[PDB]
Symmetry: D2
Subunit: 365 residues, 4 copies
């Protein structure tokens, strides 16, 4: 299935090893101004921007809109776009293209489809995330029209956790650290991973809130029993390569609390606490949507690993060259895009909820 979404539908050209990757976002309402700066900044962010960097212009990925946009405004038709990659030599990073790399999709792709076809160069994840972030930028444009914004950051790296969350600081951090007091320890874990030709896991925090200070998000986003908001968020995050767990609000700690401790009480303005993480009964309850995504350590490590080849014979996997020491970093941005796409889809699907919405638009608008 190469399509994400029910009405705001993102479809991808899928896994490829060519110089061009494409995608199409359909369901965008018309009249939304296309924020090229936002789109461009999102693509830059995806490259885990750290210490020092030059104009992402010619330096990296450029998004080419081929349709659905007329004079900087969405037309209401599909927005097709192409992303062009490298084209000037390379380095290394590989091994034996006939063995299964541990913790990689090699084995399962081989058995499901049979046809080998395996090459490095961001293999799959990388490319697809570019499609997701680009699409998410459009979803963010839609969300902004009704005052919603999505943000993210890293709260954990190798078990070293953040105590306080500062999203503004994360944006400027080399590792999107949400807690400046735990950042250095976190950076150190990353350096030790690199030093030891190893990788390390991490945890990303994703949030959706109102731009207008503390004003509630729409209440009721989420559809029926089988397209609930938290369900679609989990589907989207867990679907990200490297993700082994997803939490909404209090998450795993929820199961350790008693009813009197968890239940979120309410007063006239809203809920008094947010253990629900913004989703109650499968629908947004107005409070901030809080999501935690757990990433396993990067699969590729420059270390000998026992595995087997396509013939079933034992061999050594030794992936030379540098590798991302912690995929959770770039991952946070992708999770942020995914939350934006899911949320925008829900904003659109909710329009059919009450008869008054139809009367307003048809008998008057």
């Amino acid at each position: 299935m190469n399509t994400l979404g029910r009405f705001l539908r993102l479809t991808t050209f899928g896994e490829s090893h060519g110089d061009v990757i494409g995608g199409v976002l359909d369901g965008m309402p018309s009249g939304i101004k296309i924020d090229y700066a936002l789109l461009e900044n999102e693509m830059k962010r995806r490259q885990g921007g750290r210490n020092v960097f030059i104009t992402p212009r010619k330096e990296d990925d450029k998004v080419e809109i081929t349709s659905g946009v007329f004079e900087d405004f969405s037309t209401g038709t599909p927005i097709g776009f192409l992303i062009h990659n490298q084209r000037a030599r390379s380095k290394d990073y590989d091994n034996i293209k006939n063995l299964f790399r541990p913790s990689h999709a090699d084995f399962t792709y081989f058995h499901k489809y049979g046809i080998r076809d395996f090459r490095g160069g961001g293999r799959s994840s990388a490319r697809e995330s570019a499609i997701r972030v680009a699409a998410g930028a459009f979803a963010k444009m839609l969300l902004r029209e009704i005052g919603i914004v999505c943000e993210s950051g890293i709260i954990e790296i190798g078990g070293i956790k953040a105590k306080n969350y500062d999203f503004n600081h994360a944006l400027k951090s080399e590792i999107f650290a949400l807690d400046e007091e735990q950042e250095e320890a976190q950076k150190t874990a990353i350096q030790n991973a690199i030093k030891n030709h190893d990788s390390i896991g991490g945890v990303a925090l994703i949030r959706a809130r109102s731009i207008k200070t503390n004003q509630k998000l729409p209440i009721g986003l989420g559809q029926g029993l089988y397209a609930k908001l938290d369900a679609k968020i989990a589907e989207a995050m867990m679907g990200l390569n490297g993700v082994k767990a997803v939490e909404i609000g209090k998450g795993v700690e929820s199961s350790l609390l008693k009813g009197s401790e968890y239940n979120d009480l309410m007063d006239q303005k809203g809920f008094l606490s947010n253990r629900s993480g913004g989703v109650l009964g499968g629908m947004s309850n107005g409070e901030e949507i809080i999501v935690r995504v757990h990433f396993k350590p990067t699969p590729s490590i420059f270390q000998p690993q026992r595995t087997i080849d396509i013939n079933g014979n034992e061999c050594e996997c030794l992936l030379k060259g540098r590798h991302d020491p912690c995929i959770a970093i770039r991952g946070s941005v992708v999770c942020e895009s995914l939350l934006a796409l899911v949320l925008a889809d829900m904003v659109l699907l909710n329009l059919t909820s009450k008869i008054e919405y139809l009367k307003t638009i048809y008998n008057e608008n």
Copy 2:
């Protein structure tokens, strides 16, 4: 969205307050022997595992198949079914029902649809689960045809963790406990909850494994990039009311590990470990599929809670009577059913993967 699944599609009548609930499971291949005994035992298990019970055919349950079956065999058309309940005279429990009970869906339903309807009977929940468990019975029947079974159990109740898992013991356990040596401590936690008129959270372990002679599940279940197996498992589980977190394999512990510690190695005999939880790159890798579902404590507690009514007036919510002290217990059975439904759907979608499959069914036909 009242439909779950892509091909094996389960659609429900949704939330209701009547004596009859229904659903229809579409996509069952023809020629499957209907195991009424399985269906019946499944409806039993969803209500708990008390050592003292009253023979079936009465009180509750009793699934009425109205279509899709002929002479005890699936026809290949929609298998519609109905489940009745309620007789004459009950108990009580009902003091004002125009307020939003904390941690319940009343608030979001009201805002989304603007219609009060949250009535007695715990609102519903159990209703939908009856539909899911019944439907899961058919999915299980399908899966059995290719040597796949789904199992589940409780590994945690109020923080009391199980050290060793024995699924055969969980079946006869009053609280589906997987570790007999912690079961009493876990039962004590529930008892303390009832005494204090409170509730507690819990964690259920769901698993799928092969009964085939090779001991391996099919390899490659999971579809493309946006319908990955773990993604779909997370979507179904997290969509279960009460669930705030879903884990696959090593789950949340994955983020604390180094690549070298996590990666599952391979040798002549297959995988040496299974931290991936049987899902690699979004597709089953053959190993056992491991899922952990975290439940928040039961919402309904016989204690005073501050909230507001449907109009915004602050008031006291006091829910009289007895309530499920730990929904995780019954929830485990439902998760099991949902894994069966998701796995069965995937088994069907994978039939299109290789051209050789088409040739065998159409040419060797």
Copy 3:
């Protein structure tokens, strides 16, 4: 696929031989007054609705809503409904029921699924139509809220064509004829079919219009390239058992005209000559939607037909009893319902078209 529609989704229990049939309509906006009179009147028309009749209470089917309705108003959640039927014990009407009845689906069902079920009593159709008409009444209720109405009638029987159309006259006609000056000849054709134990085809005309006198329908109904309005109308109609062709507006006469003859024009509201049938470029142009549906003559005839049996041997199919001489008649009501369902679906999907729609609903609420 037992579900019809994208947003407004009709799902059925499917073909069955029991005494109960059901379905569920998902996606109804909340706050719509349930028109129990309309629902009941629709079920009457579906049953031929000829002359002399008895109270449909102790005579025919009744629609029992099991969910999605509170205090006679749609709640926004799934509207499940059951239809109970059957009376007395049949006779024979067919000797060895192990053969494929000509023009019936026994042959394909047998090969697709390989299960020899086959149980008389209106077989496939009839039952499904009840569900379709019941669901259509809900769709009509939604369409009325924005001033849209759907109607139909017979314009041809056994080649006997109508020249003038009067939908009021069709409503009280034994054969829903639209031309009173052709009705008698049309009825005479039906009597001859019965006399000769044969059947005849017919052509139904279906139309959607704005309740307001000389007022246009919404302009722009239809979604993208693969969910165009005419495409979905065609899909729904052709899906009715017995339909062999579907026409929109000028239909098949279009292929006989020249541009200078055909080619529609405009002014400042909605095309004059309705040759488009209210659909242009896959979308509604505001004019009346005009659809013609061609029905083949009823398959079941009390005559000796050559055919084979489940084993291949040649045998004689003799269907005793009285059969429906012209399904086009009852089918005209179903097509009317199907147009209601499709148009309502489209009205809902269209709500996502302009960003101003979203702002009006979210920023002004």
Copy 4:
């Protein structure tokens, strides 16, 4: 909705006036040899029918497959492709750019989305058709694996009907005529239309048969009640711009037949007639699938036209330069591709019908 298909899913970049249009075909089994020659020839046939009589041009549209193919075999993953076209510098053959030409969805689009988009150039259908024919080739490659082929031709141009159908002859015919005896008269009609700056309607005949000389098609293709084969064929065809009616088998002639005349009787091995057009009960019956598609005369003609602009003001439509005199010609080729796409989709969906299919694929390997 920019996606066609359920399992075999074709998604388009949609309407666009840039130098590139793209699409992606998802759901292709792996192991299918990519027949580049077929794809190229198909794109060639698409052009034929306008300014290409005898020795057709090819100095156009190149197709670039960007994914889902490795070593000339489908990999099982999405097959994304880009179609590069256009040449020369714009000059004449174009009128105003602020009006909705006569019988053009330009009027509907503005009301739906409200954007001054549009620019011209076959409006859009022409481009979408390129995506359809390219995708259709892949579907054909799949169908071939199980011996199925799709063909088409023109049976009628401006009233002049064909009496004998030779699909072989249509291939090398400048107007895809199926009857060489009526061909000259059919060409004259076009000629006259071109000379008078006018246009005429036409009818295309599409069919699918088993490649093996004197062989039956798979029986049972078609899914459930709401995804019947004819219903889906009807949906694809009617969705082509200009199509106003679709016929299956005897089509519109069916409503003029009596059961005893229409009903297809069965012989020792097959049906004695095929008035059903290969579809009985919504499923393939093994006989040839016959489809007739009616096209109105092209909206845009050189002759002076009238209608309305964007603001319902005053504008001219003296469209300079020639225009397509009969869209039915190029339309027949697109319908053929669409039939291939639907049928291939149906071939994949049918693999789920019998439990024996699952056992064969899973337990017999």
